[PDB]
Design a protein around this ligand. Structure first.
Ligand SMILES: O=C(Nc1cccnc1)c1cc(Cl)sc1Cl
Ligand SMILES: [Cl-]
Ligand SMILES: [Mn+2]
Ligand SMILES: [Zn+2]
Ligand SMILES: [Zn+2]
Length: 453
C-alpha cells in the first residue's frame, strides 16, 4: 500500500587483495551485478581517503528543481558549501519538525514518492552539479600545494576517481578527442529530496560514484537487459520525453515511481549508499534516486574492454534514433590500433576483434554505394574536422571511416547509410570521402594480432 520498496541490490565487501585492482574486481562481480544494473561496494575499513577543504572558499551556482512525477527535466544565486549546508539542514529540519538524524530513511523514501505524486504540493529544492574546475575541485587528493604522506597512498589509488579514466584497462584512455564531460569527474552537492531522473550513461558506459560524506543517497536501478522494457513503459505514460531533441544537453528525462515499473514487470532494485561507499552502474542500466539530506558525491564514466561491443551496438542504436554521438567509436578503435605496440595485450586482442567487424561492415557499405553509381573518391582526414562539421545530415552520426559529399551542397555530409539523402544531383556528381583504404586497414589489424600473440 502506498510505497512497497524494491528488493535490495547486491552488496560487496572485498578484501585488500581483491580491492587492489578496480578492473579485476569489476570484472569479477560483473556476472552478478549485471543482472541488477547497480551494485554497492564497501571498501576495506582502513581505506579512508582524506576529504579536506574549506567550506568557505568554495563557491558554486545552484540548480533549482521542482518535484513532480512524469514532469520533464533537462539533463544539463550563489552558495558556499557552508551556506548551502545551513539551508539544506534547516529545510529538512523544518519539513519534519525533527532533528535531521532522527528522520528514518524509510520515512524520507515514502515521503519522497508521496510528494512527487501529489499535484497540490509545489515543493522546490536546490542542488549542485558540475564537472571539477578551479573554482570548485575534486574531493580526492591531486597533485600541485604539498601533501601529507597519507594523501600519497591515496594519490595513485585505482579508486581515486581522477585516475580511473586514464588507466590502461580503460579503453577511453587514449582518446585524444576532448570529451571532457565524459572523462573528467563530476561533483554533486545534495540536500533532502534533491533527485536525479531515470537515465543511462552516454554510449552505454559504466559509471562509478563515491559518496564523500553526509547523509545517504537512495538509488534505484534496472538491469541492462530490461532497458527497452523500461522505455516502452515510459512511452505510454510520458510520450513527450520522446519527442526528438535538437541536441544532447536537451535530452528530456523524468522522475517515475519504481512501483509503476514493477507493476509492468520491469525488475527494479534499490540501495542506500552511505558515506565512504561506492555505487557502480553497468552498461545500459537505467537508474534514478534522491538524497536523504546534505551530502557530497563525486562520479565518473568509464569503459572496459568488456564494453567495446556494446559501444558499437550503441552507436548503431544512436543512428536509428537520429541522436548525437559524444565521440566517434571507429575513430577510437583506429587510434588504439595505431598505438598497437604499447597496448596492453588483452586490450589489443579485444580491439582486434572489434576492428574485424568494423572492416567487414565498411567493405559491404562501400560496395553498396559503388553500385549506386558513386564513382569519384578522395582520401579525407575526418579527425581534423570539428564534430559539428562532420555529422550525417540525416542520422546525425559522427563520420570517421567514410562519408559522401557533393559540390552542390558544400560542407554537408551523409554517412553511407543515407546516400539518398544528401541532394537531388545524379550519383555520378557525388564523391566518396574515406579515411583509409581497405589495404591500409588490414596491416593495422595485423599489428594488433602480433601484439596479442
Ligand atoms: O544528479 C545528476 N546526475 C546523476 C547523479 C547520480 C547518478 N547519475 C546521474 C545531475 C546532473 C546534472 Cl547536470 S543535473 C543532475 Cl540532477
Ligand atoms: Cl509535487
Ligand atoms: Mn548516471
Ligand atoms: Zn547517416
Ligand atoms: Zn548535389
Amino acid at each position: 500500500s502506498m510505497f512497497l520498496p524494491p528488493p535490495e541490490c547486491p552488496v560487496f565487501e572485498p578484501s585488500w587483495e581483491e580491492f587492489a585492482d578496480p578492473f579485476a574486481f569489476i570484472h569479477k562481480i560483473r556476472p552478478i551485478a549485471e543482472q541488477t544494473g547497480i551494485c554497492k561496494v564497501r571498501p576495506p575499513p582502513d581505506w579512508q581517503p582524506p576529504f579536506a577543504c574549506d567550506v568557505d572558499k568554495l563557491h558554486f551556482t545552484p540548480r533549482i528543481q521542482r518535484l513532480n512525477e512524469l514532469e520533464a527535466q533537462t539533463r544539463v544565486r550563489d552558495y558556499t558549501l557552508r551556506t548551502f549546508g545551513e539551508m539544506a539542514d534547516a529545510f529538512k529540519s523544518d519539513y519534519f519538525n525533527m532533528p535531521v538524524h532522527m528522520v528514518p530513511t524509510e520515512l524520507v523514501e515514502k515521503e519522497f514518492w508521496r510528494l512527487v505524486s501529489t499535484i497540490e504540493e509545489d515543493v522546490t529544492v536546490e542542488y549542485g552539479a558540475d564537472i571539477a574546475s578551479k573554482e570548485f575541485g575534486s574531493g580526492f587528493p591531486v597533485r600541485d600545494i604539498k601533501l601529507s604522506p597519507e594523501e600519497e597512498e591515496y594519490l595513485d589509488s585505482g579508486w581515486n576517481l581522477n585516475n580511473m579514466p586514464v588507466m590502461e584497462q580503460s579503453v577511453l584512455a587514449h582518446i585524444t578527442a576532448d570529451i571532457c564531460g565524459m572523462k573528467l569527474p563530476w561533483l554533486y552537492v545534495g540536500m533532502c529530496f534533491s533527485s536525479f531522473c531515470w537515465h543511462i550513461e552516454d554510449h552505454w558506459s559504466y559509471s562509478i560514484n563515491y559518496l564523500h560524506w553526509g547523509e545517504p543517497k537512495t538509488w534505484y536501478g534496472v538491469p541492462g537487459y530490461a532497458a527497452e522494457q523500461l522505455e516502452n513503459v515510459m512511452k505510454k505514460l510520458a510520450p513527450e520525453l520522446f519527442v526528438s531533441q535538437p541536441d544532447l544537453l536537451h535530452q528530456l528525462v523524468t522522475i517515475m515511481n519504481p512501483n509503476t515499473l514493477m507493476t509492468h514487470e520491469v525488475p527494479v532494485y534499490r540501495t542506500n549508499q552511505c558515506a565512504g561507499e561506492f555505487v557502480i552502474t553497468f552498461p545500459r542500466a537505467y537508474h534514478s534516486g534522491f538524497n536523504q539530506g546534505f551530502n557530497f558525491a563525486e562520479a565518473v564514466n568509464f569503459c572496459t574492454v568488456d564494453w567495446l561491443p556494446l559501444g558499437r551496438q550503441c552507436v548503431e542504436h544512436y543512428r536509428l534514433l537520429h541522436r548525437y554521438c559524444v565521440f566517434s567509436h571507429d575513430e577510437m578503435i583506429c587510434k588504439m590500433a595505431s598505438k598497437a605496440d604499447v597496448l596492453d595485450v588483452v586490450v589489443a586482442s579485444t580491439v582486434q576483434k572489434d576492428m574485424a567487424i568494423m572492416i567487414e561492415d565498411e567493405k559491404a557499405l562501400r560496395e553498396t554505394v559503388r553500385k549506386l553509381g558513386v564513382i569519384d573518391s578522395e582520401r579525407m582526414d575526418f579527425e581534423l574536422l570539428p564534430d559539428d562539421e562532420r555529422q550525417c545530415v540525416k542520422c546525425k552520426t559522427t563520420c570517421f571511416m567514410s562519408a559522401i559529399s557533393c559540390s552542390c551542397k558544400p560542407g554537408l555530409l551523409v554517412c553511407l547509410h543515407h546516400v539518398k539523402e544528401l541532394c537531388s544531383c545524379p550519383p555520378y556528381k557525388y564523391k566518396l570521402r574515406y579515411r583509409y583504404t581497405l589495404d591500409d586497414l588490414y596491416p593495422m589489424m595485423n599489428a594488433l594480432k602480433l601484439r596479442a600473440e
